Design an enzyme around this catalytic site. Structure first.
Site, PDB file in Angstrom:
ATOM      1  N   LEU A 132     -21.269  -0.549  -5.395  1.00 38.67           N
ATOM      2  CA  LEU A 132     -22.681  -0.616  -4.525  1.00 38.67           C
ATOM      3  C   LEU A 132     -22.786   0.348  -3.753  1.00 38.67           C
ATOM      4  CD1 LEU A 132     -21.825  -4.436  -3.887  1.00 38.67           C
ATOM      5  CD2 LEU A 132     -23.883  -3.403  -4.850  1.00 38.67           C
TER       6      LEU A 132
ATOM      7  N   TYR B 160       0.843  -1.147  -0.047  1.00 32.35           N
ATOM      8  CA  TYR B 160       0.059  -0.122   0.056  1.00 32.35           C
ATOM      9  C   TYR B 160       0.706   1.092   0.035  1.00 32.35           C
ATOM     10  CZ  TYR B 160      -3.925  -3.501   1.177  1.00 32.35           C
ATOM     11  OH  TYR B 160      -4.869  -4.041   1.096  1.00 32.35           O
TER      12      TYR B 160
ATOM     13  N   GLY C 123     -16.743   0.702  -4.684  1.00 27.67           N
ATOM     14  CA  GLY C 123     -17.596   1.686  -5.047  1.00 27.67           C
ATOM     15  C   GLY C 123     -18.842   1.222  -5.584  1.00 27.67           C
TER      16      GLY C 123
ATOM     17  N   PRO D  45     -15.874  -4.288   0.126  1.00 30.33           N
ATOM     18  CA  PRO D  45     -17.247  -4.618   0.435  1.00 30.33           C
ATOM     19  C   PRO D  45     -18.099  -4.002  -0.456  1.00 30.33           C
ATOM     20  CG  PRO D  45     -16.253  -3.464   2.359  1.00 30.33           C
ATOM     21  CD  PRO D  45     -15.217  -3.680   1.324  1.00 30.33           C
TER      22      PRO D  45
HETATM   23  N1  LIG Z   1      -6.109  -8.509   0.049  1.00 26.24           N
HETATM   24  C1  LIG Z   1      -6.209  -7.971  -0.878  1.00 26.24           C
HETATM   25  O1  LIG Z   1      -6.478  -8.486  -1.978  1.00 26.24           O
HETATM   26  C2  LIG Z   1      -6.898  -6.608  -0.756  1.00 26.24           C
HETATM   27  C3  LIG Z   1      -7.467  -6.075   0.188  1.00 26.24           C
HETATM   28  N2  LIG Z   1      -8.193  -4.919   0.468  1.00 26.24           N
HETATM   29  C4  LIG Z   1      -8.119  -4.490   1.875  1.00 26.24           C
HETATM   30  O2  LIG Z   1      -9.576  -4.061   2.116  1.00 26.24           O
HETATM   31  C5  LIG Z   1      -9.611  -2.693   2.083  1.00 26.24           C
HETATM   32  C6  LIG Z   1     -11.125  -2.267   1.484  1.00 26.24           C
HETATM   33  O3  LIG Z   1     -10.853  -2.198   0.038  1.00 26.24           O
HETATM   34  P1  LIG Z   1     -11.618  -0.995  -0.963  1.00 26.24           P
HETATM   35  O4  LIG Z   1     -11.506  -1.513  -2.416  1.00 26.24           O
HETATM   36  O5  LIG Z   1     -10.878   0.213  -0.525  1.00 26.24           O
HETATM   37  O6  LIG Z   1     -13.097  -1.289  -0.279  1.00 26.24           O
HETATM   38  P2  LIG Z   1     -14.470  -0.594  -0.680  1.00 26.24           P
HETATM   39  O7  LIG Z   1     -15.202  -1.433  -1.695  1.00 26.24           O
HETATM   40  O8  LIG Z   1     -15.101  -0.123   0.355  1.00 26.24           O
HETATM   41  O9  LIG Z   1     -13.990   0.942  -1.541  1.00 26.24           O
HETATM   42  C7  LIG Z   1     -13.944   2.000  -0.756  1.00 26.24           C
HETATM   43  C8  LIG Z   1     -14.100   3.030  -1.765  1.00 26.24           C
HETATM   44  O10 LIG Z   1     -15.884   3.121  -1.555  1.00 26.24           O
HETATM   45  C9  LIG Z   1     -16.230   4.361  -1.441  1.00 26.24           C
HETATM   46  N3  LIG Z   1     -16.663   4.193   0.171  1.00 26.24           N
HETATM   47  C10 LIG Z   1     -15.899   4.003   1.195  1.00 26.24           C
HETATM   48  N4  LIG Z   1     -16.542   3.994   2.297  1.00 26.24           N
HETATM   49  C11 LIG Z   1     -17.808   4.400   1.869  1.00 26.24           C
HETATM   50  C12 LIG Z   1     -18.947   4.600   2.577  1.00 26.24           C
HETATM   51  N5  LIG Z   1     -18.882   4.485   4.070  1.00 26.24           N
HETATM   52  N6  LIG Z   1     -20.036   4.819   2.121  1.00 26.24           N
HETATM   53  C13 LIG Z   1     -20.025   4.976   0.776  1.00 26.24           C
HETATM   54  N7  LIG Z   1     -18.946   4.845  -0.085  1.00 26.24           N
HETATM   55  C14 LIG Z   1     -17.983   4.439   0.777  1.00 26.24           C
HETATM   56  C15 LIG Z   1     -15.037   5.143  -1.646  1.00 26.24           C
HETATM   57  O11 LIG Z   1     -15.067   5.635  -3.081  1.00 26.24           O
HETATM   58  P3  LIG Z   1     -14.799   6.952  -3.722  1.00 26.24           P
HETATM   59  O12 LIG Z   1     -13.410   6.979  -4.220  1.00 26.24           O
HETATM   60  O13 LIG Z   1     -15.854   6.991  -4.682  1.00 26.24           O
HETATM   61  O14 LIG Z   1     -14.865   7.913  -2.259  1.00 26.24           O
HETATM   62  C16 LIG Z   1     -13.832   4.506  -1.108  1.00 26.24           C
HETATM   63  O15 LIG Z   1     -12.646   4.834  -1.589  1.00 26.24           O
HETATM   64  C17 LIG Z   1      -8.389  -1.956   1.846  1.00 26.24           C
HETATM   65  O16 LIG Z   1      -8.294  -0.637   2.433  1.00 26.24           O
HETATM   66  C18 LIG Z   1      -7.317  -2.877   2.288  1.00 26.24           C
HETATM   67  O17 LIG Z   1      -7.039  -3.004   3.529  1.00 26.24           O
HETATM   68  C19 LIG Z   1      -8.413  -4.098  -0.551  1.00 26.24           C
HETATM   69  C20 LIG Z   1      -8.117  -4.612  -1.795  1.00 26.24           C
HETATM   70  C21 LIG Z   1      -6.903  -5.697  -2.083  1.00 26.24           C
END
Ligand SMILES: NC(=O)C1=CN([C@@H]2O[C@H](COP(=O)(O)OP(=O)(O)OC[C@H]3O[C@@H](n4cnc5c(N)ncnc54)[C@H](OP(=O)(O)O)[C@@H]3O)[C@@H](O)[C@H]2O)C=CC1
Lengths: 307, 312, 294, 296, 313, 292
Positions: free
Chosen positions: A221, A53, A219, A215
Site C-alpha cells: 500500500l 527479530y 509494502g 500497516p
Molecule cells: N506480531 C507480529 O506478528 C508481527 C508484528 N510486526 C511488527 O510491526 C512492525 C511493522 O511490520 P512491517 O511489515 O515492517 O510494516 P509495513 O507494512 O510498514 O512494512 C514496512 C516496509 O514498508 C515500506 N515502508 C516503511 N515505511 C514507509 C513509509 N513511511 N513510506 C513508504 N513505504 C514505507 C518499506 O518497504 P521497502 O523494503 O519497500 O522499503 C518497509 O520495509 C514490525 O517492525 C514489527 O515490530 C510485523 C510483523 C509481524
C-alpha cells in the site's frame, strides 16, 4: 506528535509505534541507532521489538541493537516504552519441546534471554507473539505475575489473538486482581480489515490498545510505481489528490475507532520522516469514502455474516 | 519419539519419562551421564528424580549426578524438563527427626533448598509430592509451593501416590486463590496392578493432570522373569507365552500397554544400561494390535472406574 | 436408640436408617420404628414407596414433623441429573409424598455428563424455595464428593451432607477412597445392603446367590457367631456401626421381629475378638494409595 | 435418532432441532416426537400459542420436549435485552406457551447496550423462580459468549449453554470465532438456516418447474452435480454435513410433510464419505479460525 | 518424648516447649547452650524465645544466645522449630517511642529484621504476636506477615495473649485471601488460672490452633511453701502440697503433667535455669496422673469451662 | 424516650426492650404511647402479641423480636430443619407475615455456620425475616458467625442477648468486646439479676449466702443514701455501659412501666458510678482480665 492512552491504562504512547524488525536484517546497527534517535526527537516513545527479530541464526540481533542503543546513555532507556515478545522459537524450523509457545517454562527462559540481549533490567510491555491454544490462562498469568512481582515486566499485551482470547485472558486476570492484557497487536490495514469483525470490538470492550502491524500490508500500500491489483485505483486516486500512498495507509489507520496507531517499519531516517508526516495528514471526508469503496470492510460480527 | 501435553498445561513432554533411581547406587556417574545424553538424542526431554534416590547413606547422590550432567553445559539443563520430589526422609533410615519428612512448610523449605544445591540449578521444573501427607492442610502446602513459584525456584507442582480425592481437594484449593494446581500424578500402574483405574486416573482426567506410571514392569515381573529362571511372587506366564507366540519382548509390551491407556502421559522407564534405554525407545513406537490387547486384558483384568468397580 | 450427627451438620439422626420394604403393614412398621426412636426414613431402592409414606403422613399425629424424610432423584432427560430431570423428579416426589418439603434429597448415582454448577443451580432453586433442606449422594466416587463439595463451598452453598454407598463385611472397597473422602468433607456415611443381599443374614442355615469360595467365608462367619451366641443379622449391622465415619445401615424390616432385631443390633456391643475375627474372615483393602502401592 | 449432550451440560437433545393452521403443526410435532425428536424451538426456518394448545392436549407432551423459546427484531424497551424487556417478554411467553417453565430461553441477538451483570440479574430471577432452566444465545460474536459466561461463572451462575448462529455450507464464517468460542466455553452450536434459505436443497433442479442471479454463486451450487454423481439428495446432505462439523449440536429443521420429516430423519442417519466431505470442502471453502484466517 | 501436630498444621512438635527467657538474664551463654543441646538430646524440637528477653538494656540477649548456639553447627538450626515474638518495646523500659511497640506494619518490619540478625538465621519458623493490639487492623497485620512469608523470612504465624474472638477474626481474615492464619495461641493457663477455658481455648480448638501454656507453674506457686500471700489462696496451695506428698508426687511435675491432660493443649512452656530443671520437665511428660488426683486437683482448682455456660447457661 | 441504632444497622430502637411477663394488650399499647417500639418474646406469648396485632397500625409500629424456641431430635437446637419448623410455627402464632428480629436462643456447637446461614437466607429472601440476632453466645461465636455471613454478602448477627447486670459482669470479658467489634447491639437480659438488684432485702423486711447479702446491702444502703430506687438504678447502670443497647423489662402496670421509663431518663452521678463499680467490680476484657 499526537499522544493517546494505551487503551484503558495509565501509559501514554505516541500514535506512531516504532517497529524494529528491519533493525539488523535490512538496516545496520549504526543506521538503526540514528533512526531511533530521530524517533525520540520526533516525540515517538513507544518501540516494538521481538526476540525472534534478526533472522534465522541471528535471532535476537534486533534486541541486541536496542541494547547497544540504550547503552549509549542519554536517557534513551528512561524515555522509551520498550515492548518485546515471547512465543517464538529462538533456535530455524521445528522446535525442541517447550522452546516455543507460551508454557511457563518457555516464558521463563525467553524473558531472561531478552533482558540480557536488551541490556536492561525490565521490559515495559511484554507481548505474546501469538495465541497458544494449548496453554491455559492460569498458567500464563502465573508466569507473568512472577515477572511483574520481580519488577522484570510492567505490562502484558497480546498479538495475533482472536477476540474471545482477549476476553478469556482479561476475565481470568481480573478474577484474581491481575491487570490483564493492555494491548493487542493485530494485522489491520486497508487490504486486510477482518480484524474489525471481532478483534477490535473485543479489544475496545476490554480497554486494550490496538497496534496495527504491517500497516502497509508489507509494502503493498506504499506505492506499483516501483514496478485484485485493480484495487492497488488506490494509487490513481491518490495521484489525483496529490497524496503519497505510504502516508495515506498510515493516516487511514489513525482514523479507525479504537486504533492506538500503526507500527511503522522504516528502513531509512527518511522513511521515518514520511511516517511522521502521515500522523499529520487529515484525510478528507471524500477520500475516506472513496478508500472505503476500494477496500470494503466486514464490520463487526455477527452483522458481518448475518444481521 | 512421541510428544504430548502434560495434562491440561502448556508443557510438552516425551511420552517416555527418564527415571533416574539407578543413577548412583547401581549405575555410576560417568555412565549415567551417557544414558542421559542418549535419552536427549532420542528426543526424551522429561527426567524424573527424587531427593531420596541414592539410598541409605548416599541419599541425594542421583540429584548430584544430574548436577554434574548439567555442569557439562551443551544446553543439557535448558533442554530438559527437570522433575524431583519432596516428602522423603533424607537422614539415615528409620524414624525421622520430626519435620524431616512429610509436607510441612518447614520440610518443604529445607528439602527444595538442598535439592537445588545438589541439582546445581536455580530452578526445578516439576516439584512433586512423593506421597500424600494427611496431616498437612492444603492452605499450608500451597503457601509453601507459592513462595517457591514466585521466587522462580519451581514452575510446576505435581503429586505422587495420591488418592483421587486428594487430587480434587488439592486443585480445588489452588484454583480458589488463583494458583495453578497439580499438573501431573505419578502413580503405580501396570498390567499387574490396575487399581489406579478406580479413582486415581478418573480424578486426574477430570482435573487435567498428566498421569505418569511408575514401576511400569511391576518391579521386573513383566520384563520376563519366568524365562529368567533359566519380588518372589502362586497364581501370579501365560503372559510370556502369549508374547513368545506373537514375537514380542515382555519389557517392551508392558510399556507399550500403558501408552494406550486413556489419560496416561507415559511410563517412567528406568534403564540401568544404554541398550535398556534403546529397548524402551523401541517400545514407544511398538503397536499392540486389537487382538493382543484383548488377550492381555483377559489375563490382567482391570476394575475400571468407581463406583461401578465395586457396586453399580 | 443411638443417635449421631449426620456428618458435620446439625441434623441428628438415628443410627438405623429405615429403608423401603416391599400399605397397612408398612404403616405399622413405620409407627413401630418411631416408637423405637428411629426418625430417619429413606425411600432407598435402586413410585409407590413414596405414596405409602404420603398416606402415612396423612394420618397426622406429628408423623411428618418427627421424621427426617429422605428420597432420591429411557426417554432423554427422564433419568440422570440434568436440571430438567431434577425439577420434574422433585415435583413428582413432593406430590407422591404429600408434603411441601423433603429433608434430605439424594442423587441416585454419579452422572458424569452433568457439571456441578448445573446440579447446584437446580438444588439451590429447591433449597431457596423451601422444598428441600439438605442434599446427599449415592454411589459416588470419593473424588466426586470432593468435587461436589468444593464447588458448593465456593458459592456459599452447603454441599453434600451424606453419601449412600454399598458397604458391608463382604464388600469393603468403599474404604479405599469413598469413605475417606466422605470423612474429610464431613459427609454422613449411609451403608446400603448392609447384609450383602441376605448373604450375611445367616443364609447357610436358611438353606436347610454366590457359591465358590464365598461359601467358605460365610461358613467360617456363621460358625464364629454360633461359637459366640450372636445372631448373623444383628452382627453384620453392628459391625458397620463400629466403622469410622459410618452413620448407620439402611435396614428394611417387613416384620415387627426384623425391626426388633435391627434395634437389638444397634444396642449390641461386639467384643474385640469378634472384630479381630470378622476382620480375618473379611479383610478390608484400607485407604488408597496404601491399598495398592505404599 | 441420534442424541447429543447440549454443549457441556447434562441436557440430552435430538441432533435435529424442530423449528417452525393449528391442526397441521399439532400433527407433525406428534410425529417428530414419535421419530424421537425432543428439542422443540420457536425460531422459524402465534408460534408459541400453537405450542401452547399442543401441550393442552395432555399426553405428557410438555414432559417429553425440551422447550426452547426466544426473547422478542419500536417503542423503547420493547426490543433488546434490558431487564425490563426480559421480564415482559418471558411473562408474555409463559402465558402464550401455556406452561409454567421454559427449558431453554434464548437471546435473539447480542445487545451491545446492556451490560452482562444486568442480563444475568434478570435471568437469575427467572432461574430462581423455576420459570427458566437454561439460557442460550443467538447471533452473538465469539467474544460475547466469552464475556457472558465469564460473568456468569464469577457469581456461580450457569452461563450460556447454546448458541444459535447462521451456519451452512455457503456461510461458514461462524467458524472463525463464534464456533471456537462456543467450543471453549462448552456451548452447543445450533445451525440456523442450514440450507441457506433453500439454496442447498436442490434449488437449480427446482427451477425446472435469494439470488441464483449472480454467475459465481450458481457455479458452486457443482454441488448438485457431485451429489448426483454419488446419488445423494441435497436437502439431506446440507443437514448431514453440519452434523460432521466440530461443536455443532444440530440444525433447525421445519418439516411440514411426512416426507420432509422422513427426509430430515434420514439426513441425521446419513454417514457421508471422506471423498464427499473433501469434495464439499473444495467447493465451499471454510475460513479457518482467527487469527490464522487472516494473519497467521 | 511425646509429639503432636501443632493444631491443624503439618508441623510436628514436642509436647514440651523449651522456654528461653532465662538464657541471658540469669543462665549465661555457655550453660544455656548446654541446656539446649540437652533439650535436643531429649527429643525437644520446639524452642520459644522473644525479642524482649534479656530485660532492661540487655533486651535481645536471648536471641543472640540462640544465634551463637546455631553458629556451633551440628544441625542445631536444622533440628529446631524456632519461635520468637513481636510487639514488645526493645528500647528503654517505660513509655516507648511511637511505633516501637505493638503491631504496626512499621514495628513488624523493624522487629523481625532485628530478631533475624540477632538469631543469626535467615528465617523464623513460628513468628508470634506477643499480645493483641486492638489498634492495628488485621488487613495491615496480614500484609506485613505475608511480606515475610513470601520472602521466606518466616514460615508460620502464631499469637500470644489473645481473646478468643481475636483468634476467630484473625483467621477468618487470613482465610478470606488464602493465607494460613494463626497456627497457635500461647496463653496463660495453669491450675490457679483456668479462665482461658472460657473462650480462648474453645476458639483455638475450633480454628485448629495449637495451644501453648505459658507460666505453667503460676510463677513457681505450683512448684512447692515447702521452700518457704492471701490466706484463701495459700489455703489451696497447702491442700495441693498436702495432696501430692500423700501420693509421692513432685508439685513441679504435676502442674506440667496436668496441662498435658487438658483438651486442645499442645504442651507447656518449660523454662529451665539449669539442666536438673530440664530433666525434671522431661519426667513430668512421662508421668501419668490418676483419676483420683485429677478429680482432687479439679476439686482444689475448679475451672469455669466454656462460655456462655460459665456465667449463664 | 431515648432511642438508639441497634448496633451498626439502620434500625432505630428504644433503649428499653419490652419482654414478656388481655391485660397484656393494654400494657403494650401503653408502652407504644410511652415510645417503646422494641418488643421481645423473652409459645403463648406469641399468641398474645398476635391478638394485639386489633389493628390501628400496631404491627407497623413495633420491631417484633422473637426466638427459635429450643427432646425429640431436631425439635431443639439450630439445624436448618428445626429453624424451618420453629419459624413457621412462630409466624402462624404471631399472626404476621414477617419477623423483624429473629434470634437464636443459644449457641449450638453442632451446627456449622454455613447451614445456619442457609436457613436464615431462605427466610430473608422470602421476606419472612429482616434481621438475625443471637442469645447466649460466646464472643468468638459472634465473630465466626459474622465473618461467615460477610464472606457471602449476608448481613450477620445484628444483636446479642446476654446475661448482664451489676452482679454478673462477665459478659464484659469477651462477649461485649466481640459484639462491639462486629457492631452488634447488646441486649442485657435479666438486668435486675432475677430481682436481687430491685430492692430485694427491704422486700424481705435466691441466695441465704451472707457474702452476696453483704453486697446487696451495701448497694441498697448506697441507694437510700442518694435517694434512688434500685429497680431503676440497675436499669440505668446498664444504659451507661459501652455497647449496651438496653435492658429487657416486663412491667405489668401503668406504674411499673412509668418506673422503667424513669430509669431510662435518669442520669447517674460519677460518684454513684465509682461506688457501684467498687461494690460490683468488673473483670475487664480478655486477655488483660487473666494475663496482662
Ligand atoms: N506480531 C507480529 O506478528 C508481527 C508484528 N510486526 C511488527 O510491526 C512492525 C511493522 O511490520 P512491517 O511489515 O515492517 O510494516 P509495513 O507494512 O510498514 O512494512 C514496512 C516496509 O514498508 C515500506 N515502508 C516503511 N515505511 C514507509 C513509509 N513511511 N513510506 C513508504 N513505504 C514505507 C518499506 O518497504 P521497502 O523494503 O519497500 O522499503 C518497509 O520495509 C514490525 O517492525 C514489527 O515490530 C510485523 C510483523 C509481524
Amino acid at each position: 506528535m499526537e499522544y493517546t492512552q494505551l487503551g484503558r491504562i495509565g501509559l501514554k504512547v505516541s500514535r506512531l509505534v516504532l517497529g524494529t524488525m528491519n533493525f539488523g536484517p535490512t538496516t545496520d546497527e549504526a543506521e538503526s541507532h540514528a533512526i531511533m534517535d530521530a524517533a525520540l526527537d520526533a516525540g515517538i516513545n513507544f518501540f516494538d521489538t521481538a526476540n525472534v527479530y534478526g533472522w534465522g541464526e541471528n535471532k535476537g540481533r534486533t534486541e541486541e541493537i536496542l541494547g547497544s542503543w540504550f547503552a549509549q546513555g542519554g536517557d534513551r532507556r528512561d524515555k522509551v516504552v520498550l515492548a518485546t515478545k515471547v512465543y517464538g522459537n529462538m533456535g530455524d524450523g521445528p522446535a525442541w519441546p517447550n522452546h516455543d509457545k507460551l508454557s511457563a517454562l518457555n516464558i521463563r527462559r525467553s524473558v531472561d534471554a531478552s533482558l540480557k540481549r536488551l541490556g536492561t533490567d525490565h521490559i515495559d510491555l511484554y507481548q505474546f507473539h501469538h495465541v497458544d491454544r494449548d496453554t491455559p490462562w492460569d498458567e500464563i498469568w502465573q508466569a507473568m505475575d512472577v515477572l511483574v512481582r520481580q519488577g522484570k515486566i510492567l505490562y502484558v499485551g497480546s498479538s495475533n489473538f482472536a477476540g474471545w482470547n482477549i476476553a478469556q485472558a482479561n476475565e481470568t486476570a481480573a478474577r484474581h486482581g491481575r491487570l490483564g492484557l493492555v494491548s493487542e497487536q493485530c494485522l489491520y490495514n486497508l487490504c486486510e480489515r477482518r480484524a474489525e469483525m471481532e478483534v477490535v470490538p473485543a479489544a475496545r470492550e476490554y480497554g486494550l490498545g490496538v497496534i496495527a502491524w504491517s500497516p502497509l500490508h508489507g509494502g503493498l500500500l506504499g506505492g506499483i510505481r516501483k514496478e485484485q491489483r485493480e484495487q492497488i485505483r488506490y494509487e490513481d486516486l491518490l495521484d489525483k489528490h496529490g497524496l503519497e500512498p505510504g502516508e495515506v495507509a498510515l493516516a487511514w489507520l489513525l482514523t479507525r475507532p479504537g486504533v492506538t496507531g500503526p507500527i511503522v517499519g522504516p528502513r531509512t531516517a527518511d522513511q521515518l520522516a514520511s511516517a511522521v508526516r502521515a500522523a499529520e495528514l487529515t484525510l478528507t471526508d471524500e477520500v475516506l469514502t472513496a478508500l472505503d469503496e476500494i477496500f470494503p470492510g466486514p464490520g463487526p460480527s455477527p452483522e458481518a455474516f448475518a444481521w
